[PDB]
Symmetry: C4
Subunit: 233 residues, 4 copies
């Protein structure tokens, strides 16, 4: 039904907003102030967007997040691909629109995710993994219909999880936690240096999060039947 294309649209616009506001708030340099401010910006961007379209598409706005739900057998392979496609175009569009209204000199590299001189790509990949792992874990747990009438706003919980990822990570890798968010700055600045970290960390972390939740913490046992039936629809 049209109850599918609306979601794809939700994922496109939300991703454009997420990157537009996220990157926009990161322009400049610096420091606690800097980190604190950028951590809150991405976090509140997500909390806002999750309230805005979480009921419509589940507000993934993140390829690694969508990948998590795929292996978690909660969405079809067809939906996953489109979500990720919409997320990549949306992100690029947000970065594009951001570039068009931002004064040069302040533009910098459009907040491209970058490693710290003293951090190896191996350590950086492990960082991005842990960041995305606690992040996806919070998403799965709070989206789980099987629990709590005392959750409060799941939109904010997830947003603050993203903020926590930044408060810690920015010092190491600028905190990617999202392939699409990393990709947009890279494709427009023509700089794919160390970009592998920002696809690998999140995907693996997202993978370990889903697995850890569904197959150990609070098992959601699906029969091989449904798995394929779902991965198909």
């Amino acid at each position: 039904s049209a109850s599918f294309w609306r979601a794809i649209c939700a994922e496109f616009f939300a991703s454009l907003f997420y990157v537009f506001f996220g990157l926009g708030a990161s322009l400049r340099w610096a420091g606690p102030l800097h980190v604190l401010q950028v951590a809150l910006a991405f976090g509140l961007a997500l909390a806002t967007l999750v309230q805005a379209v979480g009921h419509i598409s589940g507000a993934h706005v993140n390829p690694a997040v969508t990948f998590a739900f795929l292996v978690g057998s909660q969405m079809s392979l067809l939906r996953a691909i489109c979500y990720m496609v919409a997320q990549l175009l949306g992100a690029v569009a947000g970065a594009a629109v951001l570039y068009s209204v931002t004064p040069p000199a302040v533009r910098g590299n459009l907040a491209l995710n970058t490693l710290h001189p003293g951090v190896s790509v191996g350590q950086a990949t492990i960082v991005e993994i842990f960041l995305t792992l606690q992040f996806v874990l919070c998403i799965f747990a709070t989206y789980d219909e099987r629990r709590n009438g005392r959750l409060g706003s799941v939109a904010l919980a997830v947003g603050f999880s993203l903020t926590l990822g930044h408060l810690f990570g920015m010092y190491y890798t600028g905190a990617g936690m999202n392939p699409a968010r990393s990709f947009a700055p890279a494709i427009l600045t023509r700089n794919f240096t160390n970009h592998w970290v920002y696809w690998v960390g999140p995907v693996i972390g997202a993978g370990l999060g889903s697995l850890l939740y569904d197959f150990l913490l609070f098992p959601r046992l699906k029969s091989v039947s449904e798995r394929l039936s779902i991965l198909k629809g």
Copy 2:
């Protein structure tokens, strides 16, 4: 019924508070610290006011927000006009009372919304549009009775949306997102320079937000019948 004049009163007082506390917290200059602090101040002012009178008038406290609900066919043309009237007088009053208790030298221009030297009014109008668009989108989605028992506090969600608007926007336009909030400082400092941006951006953004929500994301299909019946009451 009197269940109409109470709301108008709600919109008047809330607007006076919103501008009084919002502007008051913006006095001085500066920087992350500055932005972070002012972003939180406006955001918590709104979250507070939405809890205070959201059940009474819907706590619009914003002309662009009210305009959104008009074209969204959720209020009558009569209510909209009064809301906006109460919001403009309330704002001016808040700025007035703020001026009366604030020491000169610190008064400055009473936190008048201003463009960044390197930002064209065109880019500034597009910024204000995006700010108000994600803002109204969050308002519509969270006010929508058709969803979530996991929303948490809608008052805070909207407040944090406003904070996010500031964390990004202040650098560009000081972040207006609200004609009344922009108007009060302008009418009292007799400075309407670039004021057009602060009416145009929000109204258009607010317009694109409502449209995007009601006519694409989660359609609330009203028959031409009701539309006019509502725009009339």
Copy 3:
């Protein structure tokens, strides 16, 4: 019943905690950083305490707040007096315990509420009034059983209202919004300079808040009968 002395105890301990953590976090000087940090500290202290004992005593932890509920005919004159008595002793105790574990030199004046050189006591009284007014207004609205299943945490709403009061007020009067919180530092430092502001502003603001809510925004019509019956119990 004992369902009365537990509350008095709740108000005593909560007040000791509120002042202990509130004042403790205010030691030193300074600035956004300073204000932001102290605003959040008092705010989260209250949100925490409101969750801790709001179900037991309503977590007033504030004389002006209790006064609001008295004139609001929601508590007896006997309860009000004891609450305020417990709040004053609790506060002093918190400031006392704070003094005993804090290094001198850092102690300063134990975060005594103070006016800004350029702010007259008249302007300062009006500031404290507005601060306490939006504060009590948020308390009444969120405590009102007659509304919302979308409130979220009322504990946090009220806490953030207090934070907003500080983000704006600290620059003017250090933000009292609470006679007991102002009193404790004064009685122990033997400095009652301008102390009148910190009793007068809140009480009046608290008074205008209750009146504004119960007699205009969302009238809670009590017959003269009940009023006295309540003010008596």
Copy 4:
């Protein structure tokens, strides 16, 4: 049942995350900025983890917290021991993994809890006690099934309680409030100087919190029967 080993696993992973992100965000020095940022980091780490596994193990992720529930007769002596065991190994593991991905020079002492030169260990023990006391009090009150449909997110309430503990405490003792969180940095840096404070304060505070809640504020009267029956299972 396996509905026991999953919890132990929950407590292990959550503790590893808590310390990994908590300590990681504390690396460097400094100041409001520093404190504010670290306070929020620990706070959001907990809020995140409480949402992630609070429904599975109750998300204690803290020996003093678990001890509180033991004397509160809410868990068996067998569960308590394992929880604390999982929490200690998890913490050490988190600090270990943190060390492996962090650049030296920035590593410092891995955010080891430390006293302020002007604070005696006696004053420091009293500080840690008060910090953990308001903390456990908030945990008990918000976990109490006997109350509120207006709590909002208990995960966030507890997290913000931890943040408040840091906003005040870091200046005194770096804010331990958690034996496991203090232990991990100590065992790996081979520095147990003043470590006694970080086990004694929390345990006592946690003890006074439970007692204060269950035996005075909102008594949860258990017959000697059940107490032992519970402490046994």
